Ligand SMILES: NS(=O)(=O)c1ccc(S(=O)(=O)c2ccccc2)s1
């Protein structure tokens with residue numbers, strides 16, 4: 434029943450997923466002044482050389498680029514993590530206008546969009562088991578601002594017209610996610626949740642300080658996707674973000690400065 438509108442949007446989710454009002458929900462505002470620099474945090478290790486993408490899917494909430502995670506390829510480790518987490522998919526959240534779209538905010542600043550690279554902890558054997566553990570996932574979040582084009586994003590933007598409506602899929606091989614990363618891997622980190630139903634409190638969040646630039650034409654093409662399936666009234670896929678949730682007892686740590 435869940436989505437992003439007036440009647441089924443974030444404000445409604447708690448009725449099917451009571452965890453929505455939990456103790457470690459995401460996203461949050463990142464208060465850059467009360468985030469603690471932690472000199473014991475390691476550099477983040479992002480090893481995407483051997484990433485193998487499989488498909489791209491419109492699931493009626495976002496589009497997901499999925500990876501073959503059957504071998505030890507495309508791993509995130511280091512930083513705040515105690516193990517090897519394996520890339521399984523990425524997706525974005527974005528707005529109807531360039532002034533909103535990100536789920537995390539930085540001193541209340543909303544970026545145009547946010548990229549989520551989702552990884553699961555290899556100690557749990559697969560993604561489906563990992564999501565039922567408190568340290569099962571690590572999600573790398575990267576903000577998008579509108580400015581220069583991101584060349585490495587263009588393959589994704591070009592396939593969107595083939596997956597316009599909810600339930601459509603496309604073969605999407607050999608996409609290199611290193612093309613979506615900014616220069617610096619300086620990050621903030623905190624314990625939280627999936628930002629969509631089922632809202633499971635299983636994520637270590639690593640949010641990069643440095644946004645990537647994408648062009649207005651690139652983000653306009655995200656906005657041409659649809660929430661609805663083929664043959665229903667057209668509902669543009671925009672404003673698929675959850676707003677900041679209460680930090681509650683939590684500390685956000687910074688890897689820098
Ligand atoms: N926006 S986010 O990165 O926090 C996110 C929401 C849902 C996912 S999941 O599709 O991997 C998933 C995980 C468990 C159950 C169902 C879907 S990841």
Ligand SMILES: [Zn+2]
Pocket residue numbers: 524525526549628
């Ligand atoms: Zn997400």
